[PDB]
Amino acid sequence: DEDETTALVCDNGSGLVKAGFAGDDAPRAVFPSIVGRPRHQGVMVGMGQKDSYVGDEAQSKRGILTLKYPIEHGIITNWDDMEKIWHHTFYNELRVAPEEHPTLLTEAPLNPKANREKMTQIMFETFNVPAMYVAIQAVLSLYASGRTTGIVLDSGDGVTHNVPIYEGYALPHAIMRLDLAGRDLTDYLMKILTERGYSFVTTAEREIVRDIKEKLCYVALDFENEMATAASSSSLEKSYELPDGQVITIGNERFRCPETLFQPSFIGMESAGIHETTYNSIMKCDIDIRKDLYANNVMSGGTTMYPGIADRMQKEITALAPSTMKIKIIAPPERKYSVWIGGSILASLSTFQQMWITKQEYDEAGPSIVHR
Amino acid sequence: DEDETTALVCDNGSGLVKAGFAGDDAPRAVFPSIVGRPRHQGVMVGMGQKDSYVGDEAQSKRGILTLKYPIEHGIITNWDDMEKIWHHTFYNELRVAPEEHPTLLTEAPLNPKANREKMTQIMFETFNVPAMYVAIQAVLSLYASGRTTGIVLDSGDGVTHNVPIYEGYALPHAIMRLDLAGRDLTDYLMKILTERGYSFVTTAEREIVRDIKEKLCYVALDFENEMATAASSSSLEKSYELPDGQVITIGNERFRCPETLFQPSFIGMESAGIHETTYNSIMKCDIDIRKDLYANNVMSGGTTMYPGIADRMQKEITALAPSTMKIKIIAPPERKYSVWIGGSILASLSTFQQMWITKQEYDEAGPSIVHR
Amino acid sequence: EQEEYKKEGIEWEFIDFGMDLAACIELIEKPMGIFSILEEECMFPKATD
């Protein structure tokens, strides 16, 4: 129990932090990855002067603060502001003292060696956690779907990745990163919806375009004869009621937004798209392992939640793969937390105890110890 | 029983080790003759640091190790790495303690005197076996086919040999060695199959060309009007399904690969081929023994298993031999283990007990004792 | 034991007798030991005996 209860799992994202206790089924804490700094001197009624704001209080009060994102494209870019988000996570969100809890953290696919050593330096030397561990994100997603070999298409708020994993070892030279994700996708909907003849003028109009994207957006299979369908004008249309009455209608654009993930050309991106990239990762891997990867395309991440994403991907890679092959696109329902759940499982596991980096290992080996 | 049960038979090859107990009908243990040395520091989950890997764990993990073959062309070239394969054979594969088991080993046709003395030095002085014995490989193959005079065409993974044997004594001056075997043969198929318009790109594509060679390859008789047949395109073709769906077709090349054994010119070899060499061995022997050798061409070895090898050889030497002669090409079904089976028979035999070299003989006569 | 030799005044030195067993125990209960390997794999959705 000492640490059975006690292991923490913190998944640091570009848009959201997911956090909680190893053992739980889902994150106890989910909140924006921002750190707000007040543009003016003054106070809220009853509070003192605050130097900084994190998560939702930074979002809610955004009009008087300069908002900053510590993690650009999955990589920690500002370490002063990240130690601020961690502090908030332990002390306010989970309300635990960190110096008696083992902490499993996550990093990104080709996270620079030096960063994995730096967050270890900050975990052990400024938070004084007993022990910690850094798992790679795609690797926890895979594992949370039971398996050990597969290829994860991972897509969240600032990055998309393909991480081919074989008997647990993520394959460095076959990993692909595509910098277009849910953030890019909300801003494109924004324009095709103002372009539908609308105005997201106040900040209460801006924010909810993102809630339109999440609730009403679709990834149609045969996106071709779906536009064609749009035109005959079926009961395909969908009206959403705004903060007030102002019933906005979205028929068609509803799927023009996730067609951006297959066609980056919709947004002036010259890069290849999700399905081709799944494939290219795969023809960059060893030959003998390619049947395995093809029958185990695990999807994880908030942006892979658009319904019919899996069917489109299913047919997208069947038709690029040699017919002798078995294609299989696994997309679980909890996928917006796969990464986290994979960490919860792993860290609550009976056999993981012997991989925890302890302060004994650290004080004796330097940050190098956990770096592997 | 003391040693009736207890005699071990270890046949050391260029590609495979065959091992087991004298008495059994087939080898209890068959595995690659490799010793892998890790290119990097690290571990598998749950194991410790391993200095070395042998057999199948070396093959399976080949991407992080430098693989080495101890036996080049049937002769032991590295004695540090061979003692490693023996260790693995006794302790892990057969799980016996060697110091209470008599061990029958095999050597190659013109194995240097000094080697037969060295493996005796290592058997008795580092493994402490009670007694041992070194049989010549062709000689065990012959004997396993019942007889004592004949000529063995022996062909495995790195060497081919012709060893004329008369009333048990292999005839030194008539033995021929041709360094082209199953290893050479898999690499030639490889090219005629990529040349058929294919790609064995990942390591899971490489390995299975060898399983194509074993399953689908043929030695046609009248290889002449078999190419001619290929062209009219009969239902001679044969498609194999890869690790995945990717159904590869092999019609013709199927037999172009074993035609390499009769025509070394297919592979830039200027040496003569199998049948001519059978013959030349024979016109190098005494005159009075040549009718015997001709009616007793015993075949052994993995590479002599290609169907129709015997019919082609039958007709290959009839048509070179004087018509007054009887030709007879014996090719048994268990031939990929003839050598081993001949050792199992011999070592479990009632009369062999008096030829075992015992530690008494050794501690008293030096390695010279077994050398004969 | 050691109390007697102390009470009496005998001069006998000896190591804890438990120690002999610590080897086995660590192998089972320690972190990279049996149980752990056992309880980790239990986290792998597609692990085998």
Curated annotation (Swiss-Prot), chains A, B:
SUPFAM superfamilies named among the record's database cross-references: Actin-like ATPase domain
Modified residues (N-acetylaspartate): D1
Modified residues (Tele-methylhistidine): H73
Main location: cytoplasm
Family to which this protein belongs: Belongs to the actin family.
Reaction catalysed by this enzyme: ATP + H2O = ADP + phosphate + H(+)
GO molecular function per UniProt: actin monomer binding; ATP binding; calcium ion binding; calcium-dependent protein binding; cytoskeletal motor activator activity; hydrolase activity; identical protein binding; magnesium ion binding
Assembly and interaction partners: Polymerization of globular actin (G-actin) leads to a structural filament (F-actin) in the form of a two-stranded helix. Each actin can bind to 4 others. Interacts with alpha-actinin. Identified in a complex composed of ACTA1, COBL, GSN and TMSB4X. Interacts with TTID. Interacts (via its C-terminus) with USP25.
Primary enzyme class: hydrolase
Keyword ATP-binding: yes
ADP-ribosylarginine modifications at: R177
Other comments on record: In vertebrates 3 main groups of actin isoforms, alpha, beta and gamma have been identified. The alpha actins are found in muscle tissues and are a major constituent of the contractile apparatus. The beta and gamma actins coexist in most cell types as components of the cytoskeleton and as mediators of internal cell motility.
Protein name per UniProt: Actin, alpha skeletal muscle
Protein's job: Actins are highly conserved proteins that are involved in various types of cell motility and are ubiquitously expressed in all eukaryotic cells.
Organism, scientific name: Oryctolagus cuniculus
Modified residues (N6-malonyllysine): K61
Domain of life: Eukaryota
Region span, Interaction with alpha-actinin: 110-123, 358-370
E.C. no: 3.6.4.-
Keyword terms of this UniProt record: Acetylation, ADP-ribosylation, ATP-binding, Cytoplasm, Cytoskeleton, Hydrolase, Methylation, Muscle protein, Nucleotide-binding, Oxidation
A biological process term (GO) from this entry: mesenchyme migration
PANTHER family from the UniProt entry: ACTIN
Methionine (R)-sulfoxide: residues carrying this PTM: M44, M47
List of residues that carry N6-methyllysine: K84
Subcellular localization: Cytoplasm, Cytoskeleton
Record PTM: Oxidation of Met-44 and Met-47 by MICALs (MICAL1, MICAL2 or MICAL3) to form methionine sulfoxide promotes actin filament depolymerization. MICAL1 and MICAL2 produce the (R)-S-oxide form. The (R)-S-oxide form is reverted by MSRB1 and MSRB2, which promotes actin repolymerization.
Gene Ontology cellular component annotations, sorted alphabetically: actin filament; actin filament bundle; cell body; cytoplasm; filamentous actin; filopodium; lamellipodium; skeletal muscle myofibril
From Swiss-Prot, chain C:
Protein's cellular compartments: Cytoplasm, Myofibril
Family: Belongs to the TRAFAC class myosin-kinesin ATPase superfamily. Myosin family.
Quaternary context: Muscle myosin is a hexameric protein that consists of 2 heavy chain subunits (MHC), 2 alkali light chain subunits (MLC) and 2 regulatory light chain subunits (MLC-2).
Record comment regarding domains: The rodlike tail sequence is highly repetitive, showing cycles of a 28-residue repeat pattern composed of 4 heptapeptides, characteristic for alpha-helical coiled coils.
Its biological purpose: Muscle contraction. Myosin is a protein that binds to F-actin and has ATPase activity that is activated by F-actin.
Name of the protein in question: Myosin heavy chain, skeletal muscle, adult
Native source organism of the sequence: Gallus gallus (Chicken)
Full protein stretch here: 500 to 548 of 1939
